[PDB]
Amino acid sequence: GEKVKQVLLAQAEAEKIRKIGEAEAAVIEAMGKAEAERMKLKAEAYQKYG
Amino acid sequence: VAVQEQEIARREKELEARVRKPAEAERYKLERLAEAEKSQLIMQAEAEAASVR
C-alpha cells in the first residue's frame, strides 16, 4: 500500500515536469521567431538612416 | 533429603516452563518480526529508487 502509492504519485510528478517542459519549449521557440522578426525589421529600417 | 531429592525433578520442570519456553517463544517472535522489518525496508528502498529515477 505504501509502495504502489509512492510509485503512482512519483509518476504524476514526472508527468507534470515533462508536460510543463514541452509547453515551455514551444513558447521559447515561438518567442524567438517573433523576436528575430523585430531584429530583422529594425535592421532593414535602420540600414536606410541618413 | 528425600524431599529435596524430589525438589530437583521439580525445578527441572518449572525452569523449562518459566525460563526456557518463553525465551524460545521470544526467539521465534524476533525472527518472524525481523523478516517483516526487512521486507518493508526493501519495498521502501525500491519505491525511493523508482521515485528518484
Side-chain angles (χ1 to χ4, degrees), chain A residues 1 3 5-12 14 16-17 20-37 39-50, chain B residues 1-9 12-17 19-26 28-31 33-36 38-47 49-52:
Chain A
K3 184 165 193 291
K5 193 276 295 186
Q6 287 180 358
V7 169
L8 287 167
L9 276 295
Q11 292 164 3
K16 181 181 293 284
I17 292 161
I20 292 295
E22 181 178 11
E24 271 273 28
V27 173
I28 293 297
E29 180 201 332
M31 200 63 63
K33 295 170 186 176
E35 284 173 356
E37 189 58 4
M39 297 173 178
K40 188 203 77 192
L41 290 170
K42 284 289 301 298
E44 286 164 351
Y46 272 145
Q47 173 263 1
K48 303 163 186 163
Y49 271 39
Chain B
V1 166
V3 171
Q4 270 154 16
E5 280 194 338
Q6 302 292 344
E7 291 301 352
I8 290 169
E12 283 168 355
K13 287 172 190 60
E14 180 192 25
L15 294 169
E16 174 55 23
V19 178
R20 285 179 172 147
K21 283 288 179 176
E24 152 49 25
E26 189 66 15
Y28 175 96
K29 184 218 297 171
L30 281 167
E31 193 168 34
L33 181 148
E35 285 176 339
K38 173 176 176 181
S39 178
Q40 179 174 11
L41 290 169
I42 183 58
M43 288 180 67
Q44 185 203 66
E46 181 68 0
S51 81
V52 168

